[PDB]
Ligand binder design. Structure first.
Ligand SMILES: Cc1cnc(Nc2ccc(F)cc2Cl)nc1-c1c[nH]c(C(=O)N[C@H](CO)c2cccc(Cl)c2)c1
Length: 346
């Protein structure tokens, strides 16, 4: 059985020639060759069954990605696991192969205003579909945006994604410490169980900033420092913004802080399209409720060249509260992961 950096990839005879691409908390992703379809693929190995959060994440990533069909979202071509539940210790998710990620590209390359323009368009096109399906991504960042040779873009890694049916009040039930620090909306710190899909718009904000500078905008070294970096540029929240913070303990924490002034965008990004900076501002708005939503952001002037509602599919079938009940023991999540991967067994 082929191995990559001390990691066994039991992908039978069909898939061969494994190269490393990257890793995550509970597995590794490789490039491979499908001998059946004569095409190169990506294979993400997952080993989650020891820890309950990993099984919950694995089940969502698979259910969500299996219903999604969109040109700016990575899909699932195939899934491999043992013939019986007792033997299943690993799940292999076969996905389409991309050439690079936006993280890698920004190390080697300063992007034309046209490239930034077109990348941002694609991120929001796919985000439109994600949000349309009552899903939050919750870890948008450059290394979860894939690119190929023809400048086509795909959102990947739905490990931290989940359904929030907008017909239920989820304030108090959402997981606490989501997103990657530098891309973390302020309300994840101040309202850590009450946030919304608007946290994805924040993340896109930070990505746009990073595309204009080749430098991350809010590089906090630790949890409460991140909030300082944000406040460092946006300036202290207005009274109206502290009025929209329902959590008294966090309202007080903010009042306690020394007044900081807003740093205008054009001093941070002197060479940058004024329309880019207008959208950057509406995305990096402190108050989640005032923050630009995904449709309004596609409709912004900066993206008028690409914006067309008739070519921006939404989900035929949005996810509803019934497909959220996954607060269950890990042995029962294992059985649910078994059932969902069945459609790919002989
Ligand atoms: C699906 C896919 C398809 N093509 C490529 N191409 C690629 C991407 C980045 C590179 F540096 C080089 C290459 Cl060739 N990458 C991917 C890909 C990159 N990351 C992921 C992906 O899902 N990565 C996440 C890490 O956040 C992951 C991976 C393994 C286990 C876990 Cl638990 C999590 C898929």
């Amino acid at each position: 059985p082929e191995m990559v950096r001390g990691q066994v990839f039991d992908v039978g005879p069909r898939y061969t020639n494994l190269s490393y691409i990257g890793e995550g908390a509970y597995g590794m992703v490789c490039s491979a060759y499908d001998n059946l379809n004569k095409v190169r693929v990506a294979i993400k190995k997952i080993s989650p069954f020891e820890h309950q959060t990993y099984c919950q994440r694995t089940l969502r990533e698979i259910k969500i990605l299996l219903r999604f069909r969109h040109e700016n979202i990575i899909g699932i071509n195939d899934i491999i696991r043992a013939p019986t539940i007792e033997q299943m210790k690993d799940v292999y998710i076969v996905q389409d192969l991309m050439e690079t990620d936006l993280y890698k590209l920004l190390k080697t390359q300063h992007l034309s205003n046209d490239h930034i323009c077109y990348f941002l368009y694609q991120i929001l096109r796919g985000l439109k579909y994600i949000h349309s399906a009552n899903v939050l991504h919750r870890d948008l960042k450059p290394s979860n945006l894939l690119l190929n040779t023809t400048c086509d873009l795909k959102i990947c890694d739905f490990g931290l994604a989940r359904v929030a049916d907008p017909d239920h009040d989820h304030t108090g039930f959402l997981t606490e410490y989501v997103a990657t620090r530098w891309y973390r909306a302020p309300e994840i710190m101040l309202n850590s169980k009450g946030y919304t899909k608007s946290i994805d718009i924040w993340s896109v904000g930070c990505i746009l900033a990073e595309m204009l500078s080749n430098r991350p905008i809010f590089p906090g070294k630790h949890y409460l420092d991140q909030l300082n970096h944000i406040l460092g540029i946006l300036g202290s929240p207005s009274q109206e913004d502290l009025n929209c913070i329902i959590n008294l303990k966090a309202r007080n924490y903010l009042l306690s802080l020394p007044h900081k002034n807003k740093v205008p965008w054009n001093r941070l990004f002197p060479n940058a399209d004024s329309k880019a900076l207008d959208l950057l501002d509406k995305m990096l708005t402190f108050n989640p409720h005032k923050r630009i939503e995904v449709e309004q952001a596609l409709a912004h002037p900066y993206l008028e060249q690409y914006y067309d509602p008739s070519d921006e599919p939404i989900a035929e079938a949005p996810f509803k509260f019934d497909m959220e009940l996954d607060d269950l023991p890990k042995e029962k999540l294992k059985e649910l992961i078994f059932e969902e991967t069945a459609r790919f067994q002989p």
